[PDB]
Design a protein around this motif. Structure first.
Motif, PDB file in Angstrom:
ATOM      1  N   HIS A   1      16.438 -26.575  -1.599  1.00  0.00           N
ATOM      2  CA  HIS A   1      15.278 -27.981  -0.931  1.00  0.00           C
ATOM      3  C   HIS A   1      15.675 -28.911  -0.359  1.00  0.00           C
ATOM      4  CE1 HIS A   1      11.582 -29.944  -0.967  1.00  0.00           C
ATOM      5  NE2 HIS A   1      12.127 -30.903  -2.077  1.00  0.00           N
TER       6      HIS A   1
ATOM      7  N   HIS B   1      15.832 -39.624  -0.642  1.00  0.00           N
ATOM      8  CA  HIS B   1      15.704 -38.262  -1.285  1.00  0.00           C
ATOM      9  C   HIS B   1      16.930 -38.134  -2.349  1.00  0.00           C
ATOM     10  CE1 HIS B   1      12.871 -37.678   2.385  1.00  0.00           C
ATOM     11  NE2 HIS B   1      13.966 -37.234   3.269  1.00  0.00           N
TER      12      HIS B   1
ATOM     13  N   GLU C   1       5.051 -38.590  -6.389  1.00  0.00           N
ATOM     14  CA  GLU C   1       3.979 -37.793  -6.639  1.00  0.00           C
ATOM     15  C   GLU C   1       4.520 -36.640  -7.278  1.00  0.00           C
ATOM     16  OE1 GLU C   1       1.242 -37.580  -3.650  1.00  0.00           O
ATOM     17  OE2 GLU C   1       0.846 -35.357  -4.260  1.00  0.00           O
ATOM     18  N   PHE C   2       5.770 -36.624  -6.482  1.00  0.00           N
ATOM     19  CA  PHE C   2       6.051 -34.998  -7.171  1.00  0.00           C
ATOM     20  C   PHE C   2       7.176 -34.689  -8.219  1.00  0.00           C
ATOM     21  CE2 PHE C   2       4.101 -31.352  -3.803  1.00  0.00           C
ATOM     22  CZ  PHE C   2       3.740 -32.715  -2.908  1.00  0.00           C
TER      23      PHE C   2
ATOM     24  N   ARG D   1       4.320 -31.496   2.814  1.00  0.00           N
ATOM     25  CA  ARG D   1       3.865 -33.379   3.730  1.00  0.00           C
ATOM     26  C   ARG D   1       4.924 -34.131   3.817  1.00  0.00           C
ATOM     27  NH1 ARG D   1       0.323 -34.871  -2.092  1.00  0.00           N
ATOM     28  NH2 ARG D   1       0.360 -36.824  -0.476  1.00  0.00           N
ATOM     29  N   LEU D   2       5.991 -33.380   3.553  1.00  0.00           N
ATOM     30  CA  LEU D   2       6.890 -34.496   4.202  1.00  0.00           C
ATOM     31  C   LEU D   2       7.016 -34.430   5.296  1.00  0.00           C
ATOM     32  CD1 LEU D   2       9.191 -36.402   3.121  1.00  0.00           C
ATOM     33  CD2 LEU D   2      10.685 -35.108   1.773  1.00  0.00           C
TER      34      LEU D   2
ATOM     35  N   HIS E   1       5.613 -30.111  -1.482  1.00  0.00           N
ATOM     36  CA  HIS E   1       6.444 -31.229  -1.336  1.00  0.00           C
ATOM     37  C   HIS E   1       6.782 -31.506   0.172  1.00  0.00           C
ATOM     38  CE1 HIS E   1       9.950 -33.846  -1.827  1.00  0.00           C
ATOM     39  NE2 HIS E   1       8.839 -34.892  -1.837  1.00  0.00           N
ATOM     40  N   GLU E   2       7.934 -30.767   1.065  1.00  0.00           N
ATOM     41  CA  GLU E   2       8.850 -30.245   1.853  1.00  0.00           C
ATOM     42  C   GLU E   2       7.724 -30.192   3.303  1.00  0.00           C
ATOM     43  OE1 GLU E   2      11.668 -27.052   1.262  1.00  0.00           O
ATOM     44  OE2 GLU E   2       9.975 -26.424   3.672  1.00  0.00           O
TER      45      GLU E   2
ATOM     46  N   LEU F   1       5.815 -40.679  -2.425  1.00  0.00           N
ATOM     47  CA  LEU F   1       5.195 -39.035  -2.135  1.00  0.00           C
ATOM     48  C   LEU F   1       6.169 -38.507  -2.917  1.00  0.00           C
ATOM     49  CD1 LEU F   1       4.223 -36.238  -0.551  1.00  0.00           C
ATOM     50  CD2 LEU F   1       6.015 -36.612   0.326  1.00  0.00           C
ATOM     51  N   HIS F   2       7.038 -39.054  -3.483  1.00  0.00           N
ATOM     52  CA  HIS F   2       8.243 -38.715  -4.388  1.00  0.00           C
ATOM     53  C   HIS F   2       7.666 -38.182  -5.567  1.00  0.00           C
ATOM     54  CE1 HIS F   2      11.902 -38.624  -0.690  1.00  0.00           C
ATOM     55  NE2 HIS F   2      10.813 -37.354  -1.091  1.00  0.00           N
TER      56      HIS F   2
END
Ligand SMILES: [Hg+2]
Ligand SMILES: [Hg+2]
Lengths: 30, 30, 30, 30
Positions: B23, C9, D11-12, A26-27, A23-24, D8-9
């Motif tokens: 995270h 986030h 997605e995860f 691709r972030l 995740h991080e 993106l979020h």
């Protein structure tokens, strides 16, 4: 008993870390 | 299973919460 | 990025913690 | 902007739910 349970949890702990790490990753690439 | 297997489940949910906070930290700084 | 992207986030870490507690619940009953 | 971050979020979040769902699944098959 706990032996199998332990291994199963250790397995998903590792998967979950890969997921977070991914995740991080691709972030940043974003 | 019985409250024995529960100790194991708890042990890892705790490691799970730990990974999540780390995270969060990474994202915060990010 | 700036504190704007931070709101996002935070929004999802919150949904992440929610999934974890539900997961704990399932295991508890399990 | 937030549009990409959101996707993106999301997605995860989905991946993480699959992971949890998978975990308790194997925990039963055991
Ligand atoms: Hg778990
Ligand atoms: Hg995240």
């Amino acid at each position: 008993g706990g032996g199998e349970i332990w291994k199963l949890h250790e397995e998903f702990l590792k998967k979950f870390e890969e997921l977070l790490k991914l995740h991080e990753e691709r972030l940043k690439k974003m």
